[PDB]
Amino acid sequence: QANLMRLKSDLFNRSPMYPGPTKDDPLTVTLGFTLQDIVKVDSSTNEVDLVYYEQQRWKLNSLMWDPNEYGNITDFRTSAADIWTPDITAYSSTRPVQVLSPQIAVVTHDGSVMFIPAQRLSFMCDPTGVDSEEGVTCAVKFGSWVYSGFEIDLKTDTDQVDLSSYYASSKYEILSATQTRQVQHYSCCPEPYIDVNLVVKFRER
Amino acid sequence: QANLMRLKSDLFNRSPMYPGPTKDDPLTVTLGFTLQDIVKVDSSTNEVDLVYYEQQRWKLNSLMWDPNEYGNITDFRTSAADIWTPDITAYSSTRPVQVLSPQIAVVTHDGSVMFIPAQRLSFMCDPTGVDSEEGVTCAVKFGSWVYSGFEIDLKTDTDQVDLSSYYASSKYEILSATQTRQVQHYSCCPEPYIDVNLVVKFRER
Amino acid sequence: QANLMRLKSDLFNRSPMYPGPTKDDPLTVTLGFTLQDIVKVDSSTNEVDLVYYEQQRWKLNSLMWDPNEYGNITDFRTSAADIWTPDITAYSSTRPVQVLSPQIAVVTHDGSVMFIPAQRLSFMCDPTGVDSEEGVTCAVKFGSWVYSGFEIDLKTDTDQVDLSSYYASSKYEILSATQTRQVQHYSCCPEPYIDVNLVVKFRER
Amino acid sequence: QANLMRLKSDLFNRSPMYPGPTKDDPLTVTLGFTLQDIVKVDSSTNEVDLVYYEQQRWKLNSLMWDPNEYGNITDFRTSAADIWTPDITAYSSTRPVQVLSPQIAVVTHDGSVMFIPAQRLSFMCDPTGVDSEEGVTCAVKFGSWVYSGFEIDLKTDTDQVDLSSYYASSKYEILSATQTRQVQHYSCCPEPYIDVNLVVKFRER
Amino acid sequence: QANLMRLKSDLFNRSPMYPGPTKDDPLTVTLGFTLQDIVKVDSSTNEVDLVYYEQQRWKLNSLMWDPNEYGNITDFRTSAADIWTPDITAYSSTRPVQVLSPQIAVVTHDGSVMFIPAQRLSFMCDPTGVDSEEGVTCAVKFGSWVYSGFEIDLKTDTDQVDLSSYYASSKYEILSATQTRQVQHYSCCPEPYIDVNLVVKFRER
């Protein structure tokens, strides 16, 4: 329909693209994990592979609209290319994250954006003790690679990772999965960097 | 010929591209599988690799035409880039699907679009009991990743997967292969998401 | 020189690109294989890897010219992107074909195009009996994925595959290599699909 | 905000892109490594895999601005595509470097650019003696592939590689890690070529 | 500076791109190899992996300029995309060459282009006897895939491959490495094709 086309053209083509958050105009990105599977555990390189989907949500005054001005339409799906997206990166990654879902996000009239990328991540994790009852605990920090706390802040709706869609017949049973927000200072940089530490405790069944 | 060039121009260059389905203008995608081979089975990571080709069929009033108006031409082939395509994703995938066929679809004057992507998919599947006679059963859900039931609906012409082109000398014999439509409501989302559950029961020779 | 530049301009920039074959304007693609190696045989997944270069040659009235008008020039090399190319796909492929040669084709004044892509293909093949004197026979169908016989037809100049450039110190010795045209009907489709059957009989040296 | 959008426009859209350093206008790139993990060691091919992030730092008079002219904004983040980036290549690489971080850099009003690419590098390294107490030493040269000393000079803020973010539970312990500027002369070329030699001495736990 | 920007504009934007060599206007490409390593040797598939960088040197009247007309500038670096590059291909390759260096070339005022791509090549080679003192000899032909001798000629400045940057602690010691120009006739084609046979004799240390 023409109403969606006009809205899309007015938002993206008519106006310039969002130049990203500043110190003056900061942004708060909400993060959330849905752990689906612990696929592989490589004891010889201390590399662990996870399959999950990341909930990324944020709000821009830039992407707002009056639905009554565009034929009562509240939300729409658009390619992630048309919009600004947060550069949420996994620090301990050992191989590029593989995208497992379409690069499409949902934009709502209040300017709120919802992007749920499905990924396969290979990160640094010593699996020593996965064969025992007590299990093994591993962590990976997700945050903006380039933006400090002054520009992007991170928030989680819950500290508990979504295991509702965790692979039943997986080789590794989840004992605990936590999404904890943390502020960190790095040697290089005086400014702090916010991340969400994904902490998973697991053991083979 | 010039008649098709003009039709292709009047459809794609003259008019703006389809902004995807809405709640107001929904869409129904027909799905279907032709299972060719269960190539690999990784017992150590509970990963199974399938080679198949997926039938994607949908209809747009946008892509309709009077064949008499364009020198009696009923259907034409075009690059999938020129048209909107459904974001049909496999939920339990562990690695990005490899495309094994050209990105070309077929548009018919009634606006119906036919897209048959050939793919190699790696999904979550515990193959324990494949060495037995009873075999092992595994499933994978295919559906739109970003589009709900109110925007995209799924339909199957048959609940039986096409095994007519299944690799005779394959390492794994198909006992049963089913393609059935499902409706799911997830924790995240109030809106339902429609899928087609590919359920294959197999065993080694 | 300017004569070729002008010809290239008058053919590709001045005129719109070929919309592909139709039922009304069909096309006949000539195919040919030069088998270079049987690199890998995977007994555990019944996957065989071939390296070859495929001769694709077709003619378009679209790409014709009077060499006198363009400073006596019979032919020219151009990127495969500048022209329409047939969507010749291997049916039993298990992994995407890897391109091993530049995407350049030769165009002649009579509109005839010659395209020789070098590829590495992984296809379905049970190698049981390769360790024997009698050897093992495997086949792979090459044809247009999206076009029926009414649109594209296939032809071979010879039924004998070119083994003149077959890797001498290969782990597998070729007993016979045949390229044969065939017409087939698929369960899905009422229209027939033409392919060239590559049939190779081989054994380890 | 509009102030940054206008700045981004006046810098990138208004002016043509930087054609790279010349002999007349040379450039000095500061380099630095933060070694995160020695992932794999392949004794059979003398290939070693490192996970690290390289600090790239240069200044352009081209990218300078008066912050008081653009609503008091000192620095901003932009995609590496919008700007010129140094062609810092690892000489002994055996496989293409895998990018593990977003392609975003930070531009400051004095025209200074900070680019921190996270990478997985596979380079030539004989690990013979890694199983000993003394360990094994390996090196890799990083420098501009195409630009000489009179176009791109290299500098390090410190000769000590940043091990503050080195993977604690890694399979290989670090015994020493140093970033050292060196001038190379090649047979081919009249101008010398500058690099930073990354020298790491390590052993298994 | 504006002097180079203007030169780059007057060369690439103001004039059409070079349509490649013809029979009427032939070209001579100089080739050179700098062998860095024999990384892997696969005895089971008779595949050998080489790491090297190839000298590609050619002169075009098209790319010439008066340096006194463009603010005394002799040479400049540009992306290989901006210019025509020879389609030098390795005949016995078994997997696509991996690019290990930036796609930048150097253009001199006399119209001479220098392009030094660093590559990892996997080619057909029986390594039987590498464990011996005598070693094993292997060869790979490099030449234009689509252009005959009438179009492109190849030349080497020396028949001795550059081993000055050969990995000292490599698993395989080079006994001899030769780059020799060869003319061959192929079954397919009446016209001859010029190659540069890279011939390496090596053994494990």
Ligand SMILES: O=C(O[C@H]1C[C@H]2CC[C@@H](C1)N2CCc1ccccc1)c1ccccc1
């Ligand atoms: O800005 C730098 O690093 C940036 C890139 C990476 C590394 C630190 C921080 C800033 N950023 C990581 C932020 C982060 C991402 C995910 C999880 C936690 C933190 C920098 C690094 C070295 C020398 C000088 C400057």
Ligand SMILES: O=C(O[C@H]1C[C@H]2CC[C@@H](C1)N2CCc1ccccc1)c1ccccc1
């Ligand atoms: O919209 C979300 O998820 C969408 C992406 C994925 C996951 C659920 C659903 C909606 N979509 C999957 C739909 C589906 C695809 C294939 C097979 C079955 C269902 C979402 C996820 C987490 C938090 C907030 C919102």
Ligand SMILES: O=C(O[C@H]1C[C@H]2CC[C@@H](C1)N2CCc1ccccc1)c1ccccc1
């Ligand atoms: O049109 C279809 O399939 C097309 C794609 C593939 C599969 C059949 C045919 C037509 N095409 C293969 C043609 C072919 C290629 C290479 C070798 C032999 C045949 C189709 C498939 C399923 C349901 C409805 C329609």
Ligand SMILES: O=C(O[C@H]1C[C@H]2CC[C@@H](C1)N2CCc1ccccc1)c1ccccc1
């Ligand atoms: O310009 C050339 O080489 C360029 C590519 C490589 C090889 C030399 C130099 C210039 N460049 C290496 C520069 C370098 C990269 C990384 C670490 C140190 C030095 C060239 C090489 C051989 C024959 C003709 C021209």
Ligand SMILES: O=C(O[C@H]1C[C@H]2CC[C@@H](C1)N2CCc1ccccc1)c1ccccc1
């Ligand atoms: O022109 C052909 O092939 C071109 C590609 C390859 C094979 C022959 C020649 C021309 N070309 C080889 C060029 C070459 C590259 C590297 C090393 C030696 C020769 C051709 C082959 C089969 C049928 C019709 C035409």
Ligand SMILES: [Cl-]
């Ligand atoms: Cl794997």
Ligand SMILES: [Cl-]
């Ligand atoms: Cl595999």
Ligand SMILES: [Cl-]
């Ligand atoms: Cl392999």
Ligand SMILES: [Cl-]
């Ligand atoms: Cl690996």
Ligand SMILES: [Cl-]
């Ligand atoms: Cl490898």
